[PDB]
Amino acid sequence: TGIKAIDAMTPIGRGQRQLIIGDRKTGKTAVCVDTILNQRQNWESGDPKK
Amino acid sequence: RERDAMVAKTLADNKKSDEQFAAAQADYDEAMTEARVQASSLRDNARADGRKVIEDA
Amino acid sequence: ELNVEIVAVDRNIWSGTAKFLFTRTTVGEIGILPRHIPLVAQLVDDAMVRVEREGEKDLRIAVDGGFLSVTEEGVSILAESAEFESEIDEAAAKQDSESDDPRIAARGRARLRAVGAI
Amino acid sequence: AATLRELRGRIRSAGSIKKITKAQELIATSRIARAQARLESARPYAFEITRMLTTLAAEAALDHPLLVERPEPKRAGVLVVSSDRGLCGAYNANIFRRSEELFSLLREAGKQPVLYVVGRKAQNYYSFRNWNITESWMGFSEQPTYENAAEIASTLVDAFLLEGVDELHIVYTEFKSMLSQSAEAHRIAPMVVEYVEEDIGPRTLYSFEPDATMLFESLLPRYLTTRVYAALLESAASELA
Amino acid sequence: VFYLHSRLLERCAKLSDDLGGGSLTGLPIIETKANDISAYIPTNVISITDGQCFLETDLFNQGVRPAINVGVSVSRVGGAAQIKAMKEVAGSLRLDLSQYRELEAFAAFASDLDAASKAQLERGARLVELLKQPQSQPMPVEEQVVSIFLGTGGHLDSVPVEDVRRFETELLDHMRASEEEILTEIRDSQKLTEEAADKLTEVIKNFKKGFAATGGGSVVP
Amino acid sequence: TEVIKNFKKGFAATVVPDEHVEALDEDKLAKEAVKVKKPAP
Amino acid sequence: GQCFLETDLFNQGVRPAINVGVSVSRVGGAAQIKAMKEVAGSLRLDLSQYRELEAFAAFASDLDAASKAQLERGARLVELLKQPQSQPMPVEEQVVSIFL
Amino acid sequence: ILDPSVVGDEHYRVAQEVIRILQRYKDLQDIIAILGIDELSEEDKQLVNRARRIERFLSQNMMAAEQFTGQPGSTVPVKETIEAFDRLCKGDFDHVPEQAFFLIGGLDDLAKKAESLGAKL
Amino acid sequence: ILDPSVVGDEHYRVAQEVIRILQRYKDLQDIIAILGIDELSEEDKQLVNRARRIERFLSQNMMAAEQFTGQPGSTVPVKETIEAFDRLCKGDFDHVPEQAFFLIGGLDDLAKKAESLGAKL
Amino acid sequence: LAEASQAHTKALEDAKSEAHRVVEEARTDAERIAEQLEAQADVEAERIKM
Numbered sequence A: 001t002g003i004k005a006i007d008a009m010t011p012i013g014r015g016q017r018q019l020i021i022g023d024r025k026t027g028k029t030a031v032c033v034d035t036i037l038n039q040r041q042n043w044e045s046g047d048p049k050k
Numbered sequence B: 001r002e003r004d005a006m007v008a009k010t011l012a013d014n015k016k017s018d019e020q021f022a023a024a025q026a027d028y029d030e031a032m033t034e035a036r037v038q039a040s041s042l043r044d045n046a047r048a049d050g051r052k053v054i055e056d057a
Numbered sequence C: 001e002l003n004v005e006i007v008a009v010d011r012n013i014w015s016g017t018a019k020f021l022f023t024r025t026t027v028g029e030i031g032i033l034p035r036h037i038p039l040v041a042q043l044v045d046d047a048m049v050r051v052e053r054e055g056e057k058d059l060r061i062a063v064d065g066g067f068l069s070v071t072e073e074g075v076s077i078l079a080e081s082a083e084f085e086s087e088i089d090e091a092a093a094k095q096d097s098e099s100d101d102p103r104i105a106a107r108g109r110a111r112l113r114a115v116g117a118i
Numbered sequence D: 001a002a003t004l005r006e007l008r009g010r011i012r013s014a015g016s017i018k019k020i021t022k023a024q025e026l027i028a029t030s031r032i033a034r035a036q037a038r039l040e041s042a043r044p045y046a047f048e049i050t051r052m053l054t055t056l057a058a059e060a061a062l063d064h065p066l067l068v069e070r071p072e073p074k075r076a077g078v079l080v081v082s083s084d085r086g087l088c089g090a091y092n093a094n095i096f097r098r099s100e101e102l103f104s105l106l107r108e109a110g111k112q113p114v115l116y117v118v119g120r121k122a123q124n125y126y127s128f129r130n131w132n133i134t135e136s137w138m139g140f141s142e143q144p145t146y147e148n149a150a151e152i153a154s155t156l157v158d159a160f161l162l163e164g165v166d167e168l169h170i171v172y173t174e175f176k177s178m179l180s181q182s183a184e185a186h187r188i189a190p191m192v193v194e195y196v197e198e199d200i201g202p203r204t205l206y207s208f209e210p211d212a213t214m215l216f217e218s219l220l221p222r223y224l225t226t227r228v229y230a231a232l233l234e235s236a237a238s239e240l241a
Numbered sequence E: 001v002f003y004l005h006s007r008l009l010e011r012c013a014k015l016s017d018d019l020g021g022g023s024l025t026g027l028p029i030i031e032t033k034a035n036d037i038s039a040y041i042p043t044n045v046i047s048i049t050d051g052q053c054f055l056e057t058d059l060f061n062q063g064v065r066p067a068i069n070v071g072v073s074v075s076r077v078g079g080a081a082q083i084k085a086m087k088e089v090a091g092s093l094r095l096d097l098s099q100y101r102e103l104e105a106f107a108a109f110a111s112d113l114d115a116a117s118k119a120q121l122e123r124g125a126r127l128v129e130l131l132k133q134p135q136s137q138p139m140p141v142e143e144q145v146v147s148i149f150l151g152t153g154g155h156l157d158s159v160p161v162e163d164v165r166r167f168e169t170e171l172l173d174h175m176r177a178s179e180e181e182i183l184t185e186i187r188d189s190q191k192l193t194e195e196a197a198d199k200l201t202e203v204i205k206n207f208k209k210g211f212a213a214t215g216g217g218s219v220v221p
Numbered sequence F: 001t002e003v004i005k006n007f008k009k010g011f012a013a014t015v016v017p018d019e020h021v022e023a024l025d026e027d028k029l030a031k032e033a034v035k036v037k038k039p040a041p
Numbered sequence G: 001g002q003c004f005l006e007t008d009l010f011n012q013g014v015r016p017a018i019n020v021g022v023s024v025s026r027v028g029g030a031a032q033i034k035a036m037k038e039v040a041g042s043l044r045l046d047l048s049q050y051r052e053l054e055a056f057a058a059f060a061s062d063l064d065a066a067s068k069a070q071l072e073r074g075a076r077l078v079e080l081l082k083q084p085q086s087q088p089m090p091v092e093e094q095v096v097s098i099f100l
Numbered sequence H, I: 001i002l003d004p005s006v007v008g009d010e011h012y013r014v015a016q017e018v019i020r021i022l023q024r025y026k027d028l029q030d031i032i033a034i035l036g037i038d039e040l041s042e043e044d045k046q047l048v049n050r051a052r053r054i055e056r057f058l059s060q061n062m063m064a065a066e067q068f069t070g071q072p073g074s075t076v077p078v079k080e081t082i083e084a085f086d087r088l089c090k091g092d093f094d095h096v097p098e099q100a101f102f103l104i105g106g107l108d109d110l111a112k113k114a115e116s117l118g119a120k121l
Numbered sequence J: 001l002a003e004a005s006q007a008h009t010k011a012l013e014d015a016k017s018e019a020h021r022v023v024e025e026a027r028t029d030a031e032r033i034a035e036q037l038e039a040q041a042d043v044e045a046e047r048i049k050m
């Protein structure tokens, strides 16, 4: 995900479901958008496995 | 008189020697922290005008 | 040899063995050797206790508010305050000796006796 | 609605309070250890000055003002030793109960209590009751030094020798066995001459410079101060427990 | 409605190698009201998913951003979803943070604490400052490994708490510019061997003697 | 304001309590003593 | 606007039992004569801040001069607004009391 | 738009520090209610004083509220707001009472109401 | 069914003694964590040692672990467990190192594991 | 005292030399950072042109 808190404490694997749950204006969309943005290097690698 | 002046000069020499000894590390750290604060002056002005040119471009 | 026990109001200043304890009571200077008649005395305001051991060098302790007690056990010195020789800064010990407050001037004079001056 | 909100609010409030009180209890434990250390550190000087005072009184003129009781006792100066902080239990309340018992004992004998306090809690308790506090000392209840005790004892002995008191008492919490914090009233002046026994038979004669009476009268206020300091240390350890 | 959400979230799967080996990772989002995770739909989706990241408003206002409650957040996959370097540098992180949370009440009583307890307090403060991150700034895994190494190895015990973010930023900048071999072979080998750790310690020491704290002091141990 | 101050000129607003505590037992008031060794009871 | 009466304030002796912090009039000073509008200018905000300070300083060991002055003035103002039942005051006497 | 890219670094940093101080004050309010301001740290007491002054300086005499208090309203520019709250957060007004921050405008009104109380900015 | 009429008198007494010791250790754990084991009393430290020993002897080598380690799992009878924990509550093993209690079976495994670290009964 | 004085002047001159050696790397990494920023400039421009 690119977030140190998640990747270190609550790691998400390929095929897993990690609920993001919070009140409002707590940063849920930010977490998910950062996760999406973190795949930019994977896409640049061109490898369908990555 | 000469011998008493000699023992006094020896005491003062020991004291001043130990004081200059401490001042050695003192001014060494002073100079290197002046140097590293000068260094940290750079790498931010570079970041400053880098941000300025990135935004103006 | 004699057993010295210098105790303060809240701590044991020093304790050990000596061959000669020099101090100054309110009636004059005194020096205690291993065997010595039982005695109770009061040290002077600006008292300095000099302790002499066999191999070491003379301890020199400024004592403030002391009472000397020689017994069969040895020497026992009660103090309100005490300061060893190698713990006094002669600047404050000198500009306190010039003070107008009696007991603080006495303390300064004791520290000055202990550092070597006066 | 809005009842569950206030209930959750009270729950988080009580949780904060619980955390704070648990931390305060562990801190108080550590500081009890420290205060017991200070007490057992001040013990030796007390023992030695007591022994020297006994040796001096053996051959002295026992007519010192601090040693003879006065006909026409009109006033007793009481020193109440309380705390500055308030998260203790019935510590201050027990001190105040003992002090009221002492005041009602002193009014039975015609004496007028003159009140000196140590601590802010006693200040509050006695100003609320429109008392007359001659002197107050604050800020050294949890770590008292010998200089505070010296000041207190000098003021008390000056009041005793003189606008003048005929007795001197101390109401403080005695600390014993780490399990007994007991408020006690002691009489520090005038002292009572108690004869134990010859104990040792013929023994060596003690030399006194200049003589026994001078040293005795020089040691008596020092002994008062040592006892005031021991009382302060015991009360500090008791307050922490 | 439980069926409505479980039917949807059970289609996120990791397929077997016979089916191609593809995968679909789901990140469902649930908004709670007044931090009530015992509401109906929150309960359902907490029951369905494999792990939860709980985000608090209080943690957000305290400066902890992302505002993740690491105490209650959980991943049931766990270390099976980490590379070995991250699995190794972050194994001593959860217990450290729990100890810091237990000891937070003794912040103003460091002198009244065991030396180990004050060490745990300072380490936990550094680790809480280390898990902060700006918005829209994700880090590659090698840099997260280097950052959590800085944290849990002890190389932040000499940096002021209020300088940990800047120290980590500038150190990662330095390593991106100067020592690209460490990051490159962490990324390639997925582990942090002993020689990589040694070179990393060397670089950290040189940077520390180069780094300038905000209080004028030195971060050199 | 003048009227109020002239009125405060003549306005009249409206010791230790007993606590009804019983005397301490004299046996429990400790007395600091000087343990002399001379025989003279 | 609303005048919120409370049984806790009633039992405390505050009568009328108006909770000054949550009571309000949306018309405001337009519903007063100029004398009352000028003497009771920020009286409601003053009493609200006084209740806040009294709640905050419930266990304060020492307080600076400004906080203690606020507490004294607020206590006097609270005692000044108490009134018996069926005992009205003309508006000029109310102006005089608020001026006090 | 409370974002460093929109409002600037100083605006954002001052807002975040104000919010953090107010959050810490909210966390400490329960202890202060039950145990008192005395059982707090020196840092916590400093923060509580700063937070009371901050929460009073956030209030303002509004133009549409003159009908309720009789006091006219005030307009404060955003740069003055940011600089004033940066000073409050650093602690440059820890000697001014809690009042004189209440229903005022900028720093000039702060000075005037502080001196009307016997204080100096 | 931890009741004297179901399991017996000695089973119940041993279980209750174990539970008492573990609860006291739980109470002391926070004093140990914040202050340190050096601050505790003498009976306190003794109980801490005995309770760590009982904690570790409650562990076992499970039959689900034969796949990794390769050594079979223990099936300790009730009588042997009661007797072993009675002895552990008395203190017959306070000289044995802690590690001698991790993942073993009855008392024979305890002895053979202890003498592997240099400790007898 | 002779040794202490010569050690003081030696340490002083080494301190100044080390100050120079450090500001060297300072300005070097400064020009490198400026270069990285100018490099980001063209790509951030093209990302908007496209």
Ligand SMILES: Nc1ncnc2c1ncn2[C@@H]1O[C@H](COP(=O)(O)OP(=O)(O)OP(=O)(O)O)[C@@H](O)[C@H]1O
Binding pocket: A022, A023, A024, A025, A026, A027, A028, A029, A030, A031, E065, E066, E133, E134, E135, H001, H002, H003
């Ligand atoms: N890691 C972060 N650091 C700093 N600011 C952040 C961070 N994450 C989010 N924010 C800020 O918090 C604000 C709200 O976050 P976000 O909109 O992502 O929350 P949300 O869960 O989508 O809430 P909602 O759906 O109610 O808007 C945003 O303006 C964003 O700038």
Ligand SMILES: [Mg+2]
Binding pocket: A028, A029
């Ligand atoms: Mg959103």
